[PDB]
Design an enzyme around this catalytic site. Structure first.
Site, short mmCIF file in Angstrom:
data_model
loop_
_atom_site.label_atom_id
_atom_site.label_comp_id
_atom_site.label_asym_id
_atom_site.label_seq_id
_atom_site.Cartn_x
_atom_site.Cartn_y
_atom_site.Cartn_z
N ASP A 120 36.87 23.56 59.31
CA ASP A 120 37.02 24.92 58.78
C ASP A 120 38.00 24.99 57.60
OD1 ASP A 120 36.08 27.59 58.71
OD2 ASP A 120 37.44 28.29 60.30
N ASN A 125 42.77 29.35 55.48
CA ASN A 125 43.37 28.35 56.37
C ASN A 125 44.34 27.41 55.66
OD1 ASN A 125 42.18 29.35 58.73
ND2 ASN A 125 40.46 27.91 58.67
C1 LIG Z 1 43.72 42.17 55.04
C2 LIG Z 1 45.17 41.79 55.01
O1 LIG Z 1 46.04 42.65 54.96
N1 LIG Z 1 45.49 40.46 55.08
C3 LIG Z 1 46.89 39.99 55.00
C4 LIG Z 1 47.17 38.98 56.10
N2 LIG Z 1 46.20 37.87 56.05
C5 LIG Z 1 46.51 36.74 56.94
C6 LIG Z 1 46.89 37.11 58.39
C7 LIG Z 1 47.23 35.87 59.24
C8 LIG Z 1 48.29 35.02 58.57
N3 LIG Z 1 48.62 33.85 59.38
C9 LIG Z 1 49.78 33.18 59.39
N4 LIG Z 1 50.79 33.64 58.62
C10 LIG Z 1 51.94 32.97 58.62
N5 LIG Z 1 52.24 31.83 59.32
N6 LIG Z 1 51.18 31.39 60.10
C11 LIG Z 1 51.19 30.25 60.90
C12 LIG Z 1 49.98 30.16 61.50
C13 LIG Z 1 49.18 31.28 61.08
C14 LIG Z 1 47.79 31.65 61.54
C15 LIG Z 1 47.69 31.75 63.06
C16 LIG Z 1 46.71 30.72 60.97
C17 LIG Z 1 45.93 31.27 59.80
N7 LIG Z 1 45.18 30.40 59.14
O2 LIG Z 1 45.99 32.47 59.51
C18 LIG Z 1 49.96 32.03 60.22
C19 LIG Z 1 47.83 34.58 57.18
C20 LIG Z 1 47.52 35.79 56.29
C21 LIG Z 1 44.83 38.39 56.21
C22 LIG Z 1 44.51 39.37 55.10
#
Ligand SMILES: CC(=O)N1CCN([C@H]2CC[C@H](Nc3ncnn4ccc([C@H](C)CC(N)=O)c34)CC2)CC1
Length: 260
Positions: A120, A125
């Protein structure tokens, strides 16, 4: 890894507040140390812990513990969000884009050297830490061959991956799509755009209908044709329809280094 209780993670997310503690999907923003809490299927939970235990690298997100999966919080979000300047963030410079592309390839190299297929690879990611260092995330589909359950994001998937094959060569194709997103600042798929799929710009350039210069993200001021064409050449090699004609991750990693 550290073992956590459900209540022990419930109040850090302020009773799982949908706004505000919700990040996306479900992913919530807590504190232990700033952390990212992924609340989930059970099969993908076990595999995620198995891959994280053996795979520790500077270009891979770090798993803190389990319960719910807790990761160290990436302050600069995903590469997808940063490329679209989501929530008012400034555009990424060409210099930063090159380091991010190199970092992402180093992360995929580590996974492949340890005989692991991500399955993926996409800009959503690829996470960005305090220094904008590329961190590969989401190992729920990762595998150590055919399958009846075709999984992944279609906009990034290799033709053989959509046909059911599981191979590290499909990870290379998906990385090629990420490289085009980095060059163009465009999402891999856009229904309200022609062509709808970004991978199709490779055909437009090869048929001389358009040039790489026509597609360069206009939200940069520091891009030079030499390095932009060298990254596009890597992307083009990665996006070969014949899996065996794609370069391996070590050659991709080698080509991206010669670029800087
Ligand atoms: C529509 C809107 O407002 N958005 C703004 C926010 N965006 C995303 C939300 C999740 C976010 N995930 C993570 N952020 C930070 N650290 N971290 C460690 C592991 C992970 C995740 C579990 C794995 C992953 N690949 O996401 C994260 C990344 C940014 C979507 C669109």
């Amino acid at each position: 890894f550290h073992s956590f209780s459900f209540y022990e993670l419930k109040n850090v997310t302020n009773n799982f507040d949908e706004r505000g503690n919700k990040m996306g999907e479900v992913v919530y923003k807590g504190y232990v140390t700033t952390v990212a809490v992924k609340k989930l299927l059970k099969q993908q939970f076990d595999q995620e812990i198995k891959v994280m235990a053996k795979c520790q690298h500077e270009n891979l997100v770090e798993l803190l513990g389990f319960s719910c999966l807790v990761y160290v919080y990436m302050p600069n979000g995903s590469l997808l969000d940063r490329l679209s300047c989501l929530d008012g963030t400034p555009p990424l410079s060409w210099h930063m884009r090159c380091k991010i592309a190199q970092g992402a390839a180093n992360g995929i190299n580590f996974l492949h050297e340890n005989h692991h297929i991500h399955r993926d690879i996409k800009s959503a990611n690829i996470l960005l830490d305090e220094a904008f260092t590329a961190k590969i995330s989401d190992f729920g589909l990762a595998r150590a061959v055919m399958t009846s359950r075709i999984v992944g994001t279609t906009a990034y998937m290799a033709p053989e991956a959509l046909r059911g094959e599981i191979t590290p060569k499909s990870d290379i194709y998906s990385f090629g799509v990420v490289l085009l997103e980095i060059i163009t600042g465009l999402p891999a798929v856009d229904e309200h755009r022609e062509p709808q799929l970004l991978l199709d710009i490779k055909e437009e350039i090869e048929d001389e209908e358009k040039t790489i210069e026509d597609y360069i993200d206009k939200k940069m001021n520091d891009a030079d044709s030499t390095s932009v064409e060298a990254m596009y050449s890597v992307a083009s090699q990665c996006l070969h329809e014949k899996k065996n004609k794609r370069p391996d991750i070590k050659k991709v990693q080698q080509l991206l280094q010669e670029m800087t």
